[PDB]
Design an enzyme around this catalytic site. Structure first.
Site, PDB file in Angstrom:
ATOM      1  N   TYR A  71      82.766 -33.218 -32.056  1.00 42.15           N
ATOM      2  CA  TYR A  71      82.041 -34.007 -30.971  1.00 42.15           C
ATOM      3  C   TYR A  71      82.629 -33.572 -29.704  1.00 42.15           C
ATOM      4  CZ  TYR A  71      80.408 -36.880 -34.829  1.00 42.15           C
ATOM      5  OH  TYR A  71      79.795 -37.245 -35.862  1.00 42.15           O
ATOM      6  N   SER A  72      81.957 -33.289 -28.666  1.00 45.37           N
ATOM      7  CA  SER A  72      82.268 -33.105 -27.353  1.00 45.37           C
ATOM      8  C   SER A  72      83.178 -34.428 -26.807  1.00 45.37           C
ATOM      9  CB  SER A  72      80.966 -32.972 -26.203  1.00 45.37           C
ATOM     10  OG  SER A  72      80.018 -32.072 -26.808  1.00 45.37           O
ATOM     11  N   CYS A 253      73.703 -28.706 -22.065  1.00 46.99           N
ATOM     12  CA  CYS A 253      74.092 -29.524 -23.514  1.00 46.99           C
ATOM     13  C   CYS A 253      73.087 -30.634 -24.092  1.00 46.99           C
ATOM     14  CB  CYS A 253      75.399 -30.139 -22.973  1.00 46.99           C
ATOM     15  SG  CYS A 253      76.481 -30.899 -24.524  1.00 46.99           S
ATOM     16  N   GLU A 293      75.790 -25.366 -24.920  1.00 44.29           N
ATOM     17  CA  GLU A 293      76.180 -26.141 -26.169  1.00 44.29           C
ATOM     18  C   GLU A 293      75.300 -26.848 -26.691  1.00 44.29           C
ATOM     19  OE1 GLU A 293      80.883 -27.395 -26.722  1.00 44.29           O
ATOM     20  OE2 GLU A 293      79.538 -29.027 -26.240  1.00 44.29           O
ATOM     21  N   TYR A 295      72.899 -28.474 -30.224  1.00 42.95           N
ATOM     22  CA  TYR A 295      73.201 -28.952 -31.653  1.00 42.95           C
ATOM     23  C   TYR A 295      72.118 -29.502 -32.083  1.00 42.95           C
ATOM     24  CZ  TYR A 295      75.197 -32.787 -28.514  1.00 42.95           C
ATOM     25  OH  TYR A 295      75.322 -33.625 -27.754  1.00 42.95           O
TER      26      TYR A 295
HETATM   27  C1  LIG Z   1      79.848 -28.385 -30.442  1.00 43.08           C
HETATM   28  C2  LIG Z   1      79.120 -29.840 -30.754  1.00 43.08           C
HETATM   29  C3  LIG Z   1      79.458 -30.749 -30.159  1.00 43.08           C
HETATM   30  C4  LIG Z   1      78.764 -32.049 -30.508  1.00 43.08           C
HETATM   31  N1  LIG Z   1      78.914 -33.140 -29.682  1.00 43.08           N
HETATM   32  C5  LIG Z   1      78.330 -34.223 -29.938  1.00 43.08           C
HETATM   33  C6  LIG Z   1      78.528 -35.411 -29.163  1.00 43.08           C
HETATM   34  O1  LIG Z   1      79.192 -35.628 -28.128  1.00 43.08           O
HETATM   35  N2  LIG Z   1      78.024 -36.616 -29.602  1.00 43.08           N
HETATM   36  C7  LIG Z   1      77.226 -36.747 -30.565  1.00 43.08           C
HETATM   37  O2  LIG Z   1      76.671 -37.620 -31.111  1.00 43.08           O
HETATM   38  N3  LIG Z   1      77.196 -35.592 -31.577  1.00 43.08           N
HETATM   39  C8  LIG Z   1      77.560 -34.490 -31.532  1.00 43.08           C
HETATM   40  N4  LIG Z   1      77.661 -33.203 -31.840  1.00 43.08           N
HETATM   41  C9  LIG Z   1      76.593 -33.380 -33.389  1.00 43.08           C
HETATM   42  C10 LIG Z   1      77.824 -33.997 -34.183  1.00 43.08           C
HETATM   43  O3  LIG Z   1      78.789 -32.820 -34.716  1.00 43.08           O
HETATM   44  C11 LIG Z   1      77.435 -34.445 -35.811  1.00 43.08           C
HETATM   45  O4  LIG Z   1      76.337 -33.301 -36.071  1.00 43.08           O
HETATM   46  C12 LIG Z   1      76.297 -35.516 -35.773  1.00 43.08           C
HETATM   47  O5  LIG Z   1      77.185 -36.493 -35.203  1.00 43.08           O
HETATM   48  C13 LIG Z   1      75.730 -35.881 -37.140  1.00 43.08           C
HETATM   49  O6  LIG Z   1      76.726 -35.766 -37.935  1.00 43.08           O
HETATM   50  P1  LIG Z   1      76.922 -36.981 -39.128  1.00 43.08           P
HETATM   51  O7  LIG Z   1      78.083 -36.667 -39.869  1.00 43.08           O
HETATM   52  O8  LIG Z   1      76.690 -38.163 -38.393  1.00 43.08           O
HETATM   53  O9  LIG Z   1      75.611 -36.369 -40.009  1.00 43.08           O
HETATM   54  P2  LIG Z   1      75.217 -35.476 -41.526  1.00 43.08           P
HETATM   55  O10 LIG Z   1      75.697 -36.808 -42.462  1.00 43.08           O
HETATM   56  O11 LIG Z   1      75.912 -34.103 -41.694  1.00 43.08           O
HETATM   57  O12 LIG Z   1      73.978 -35.467 -41.509  1.00 43.08           O
HETATM   58  C14 LIG Z   1      73.309 -34.199 -40.787  1.00 43.08           C
HETATM   59  C15 LIG Z   1      72.556 -33.524 -41.758  1.00 43.08           C
HETATM   60  O13 LIG Z   1      71.198 -34.164 -42.174  1.00 43.08           O
HETATM   61  C16 LIG Z   1      70.331 -33.485 -41.580  1.00 43.08           C
HETATM   62  N5  LIG Z   1      69.558 -34.060 -40.547  1.00 43.08           N
HETATM   63  C17 LIG Z   1      69.770 -34.345 -39.350  1.00 43.08           C
HETATM   64  N6  LIG Z   1      68.818 -35.127 -38.296  1.00 43.08           N
HETATM   65  C18 LIG Z   1      67.794 -34.832 -39.173  1.00 43.08           C
HETATM   66  C19 LIG Z   1      66.180 -35.107 -38.989  1.00 43.08           C
HETATM   67  N7  LIG Z   1      65.674 -35.534 -37.807  1.00 43.08           N
HETATM   68  N8  LIG Z   1      65.374 -34.980 -39.953  1.00 43.08           N
HETATM   69  C20 LIG Z   1      65.970 -34.576 -41.016  1.00 43.08           C
HETATM   70  N9  LIG Z   1      67.028 -34.073 -41.276  1.00 43.08           N
HETATM   71  C21 LIG Z   1      67.899 -34.324 -40.599  1.00 43.08           C
HETATM   72  C22 LIG Z   1      70.784 -31.963 -41.769  1.00 43.08           C
HETATM   73  O14 LIG Z   1      70.915 -31.512 -43.090  1.00 43.08           O
HETATM   74  C23 LIG Z   1      72.226 -32.188 -40.831  1.00 43.08           C
HETATM   75  O15 LIG Z   1      73.031 -31.343 -41.215  1.00 43.08           O
HETATM   76  C24 LIG Z   1      77.952 -32.004 -31.554  1.00 43.08           C
HETATM   77  C25 LIG Z   1      77.911 -30.877 -32.334  1.00 43.08           C
HETATM   78  C26 LIG Z   1      78.393 -29.717 -31.923  1.00 43.08           C
HETATM   79  C27 LIG Z   1      78.190 -28.660 -32.863  1.00 43.08           C
END
Ligand SMILES: Cc1cc2nc3c(=O)[nH]c(=O)nc-3n(C[C@H](O)[C@H](O)[C@H](O)COP(=O)(O)OP(=O)(O)OC[C@H]3O[C@@H](n4cnc5c(N)ncnc54)[C@H](O)[C@@H]3O)c2cc1C
Length: 295
Positions: A71-72, A253, A293, A295
């Protein structure tokens, strides 16, 4: 000099949640939360534009322990209370459709974070990232192209630049250049940090411009919904003229694939002066002046 990986996933920092406040006001789409964590007890230092990992509890569907999600960081190096004791995040709750096993699926770490209570213990890793760093030059121009939670490193820049308490705490950085934020969200309730962003613009009208792309409330000239690419197309000549400055840094971003329409808009602007943008952009990336950046 830049702090990196003071904590790692095998021995993370155990921080406590201080606050979990809503950023999407009533009438908006989805849930985005500002979550502040306590860093006392350890040595987690960070700067602006960096990220941290959060390791959610329990296991996945295969029985294996959950991995970190990056998370950023939403706060400056000093934290929201300018005390060098906290770190903040800006977390969207991920929710989606019906052809993905079940009816509504909620994302693991982001539903965990968005529903987390004050007092709870969290596994924090990092900080990571050298891709979205702010220059130390007070005279630099900063273009910020943000979609949704892409606001999050832009918050850290704009707070360091323009908050009264930050300017008092950073004697070596009294910002006097120009900053432009183009912010794309669906609704006016979805403008994350609206009141504070608009306070900065009223206080510093010659040093900060705030442009909105609000898709449910505004239309582009073609009659479609207003996105960030349309506002970049509207201002393509101005933005290209600013990008030509040796001291201008641009920050992108937000969602993956937002780069495409921004590139097409600046390509038409650069072509008017005989420059091919995709080649000029390669040189800006090499100079460390085009920061992406997504995602
Ligand atoms: C450098 C960087 C910075 C980030 N900064 C932020 C930030 O500031 N704030 C923020 O909220 N997030 C940020 N993110 C994204 C964050 O890291 C997580 O990916 C996001 O919060 C979702 O993680 P989770 O554990 O909630 O989801 P998971 O439980 O891992 O669910 C995600 C997975 O489900 C699937 N999925 C997701 N969306 C969909 C869709 N519409 N349709 C179908 N399948 C889907 C994919 O397989 C994905 O891998 C950032 C990512 C990166 C790489």
């Amino acid at each position: 000099d830049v702090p990196v990986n003071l904590y790692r996933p095998n021995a993370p920092f155990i921080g406590k949640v201080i606050s979990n406040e809503p950023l999407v006001k009533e009438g908006g789409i989805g849930i985005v939360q500002h979550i502040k964590f306590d860093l006392t007890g350890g040595n987690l230092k960070y700067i602006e534009g960096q990220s941290i990992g959060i390791i959610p509890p329990g296991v996945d569907k295969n029985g294996k322990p959950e991995k970190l999600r990056l998370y950023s960081i939403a706060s400056t190096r000093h934290g929201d209370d300018v005390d060098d004791k906290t770190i903040s995040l800006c977390v969207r709750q991920l929710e989606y459709k019906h052809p993905e096993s079940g009816e509504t699926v909620y994302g693991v770490c982001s539903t965990y974070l968005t529903h987390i209570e004050p007092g709870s213990e969290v596994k924090i890793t990092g900080p990571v990232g050298k891709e979205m760093l702010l220059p130390d030059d007070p005279e630099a121009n900063v273009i910020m192209l943000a979609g949704g939670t892409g606001i999050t490193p832009m918050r850290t820049y704009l707070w360091r630049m323009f908050k009264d308490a930050e300017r008092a705490a950073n004697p070596e950085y009294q910002f006097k250049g120009f900053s432009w934020l183009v912010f794309g969200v669906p609704t006016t309730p979805n403008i994350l940090y609206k009141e504070e962003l608009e306070e900065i613009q009223q206080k510093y009208p010659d040093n900060f411009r705030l442009t909105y792309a609000i898709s449910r409330e505004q239309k582009n000239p073609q009659g479609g919904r207003m996105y960030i690419q349309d506002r970049v197309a509207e201002h393509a000549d101005q933005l290209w003229q600013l990008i030509k400055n040796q001291k201008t840094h641009t920050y992108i971003c937000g969602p993956r694939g937002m780069e495409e329409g921004i590139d097409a808009a600046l390509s038409a602007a650069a072509a008017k002066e005989g420059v091919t943008w995709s080649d000029y952009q390669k040189d800006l990336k090499k100079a460390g002046r085009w920061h992406v950046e997504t995602y």
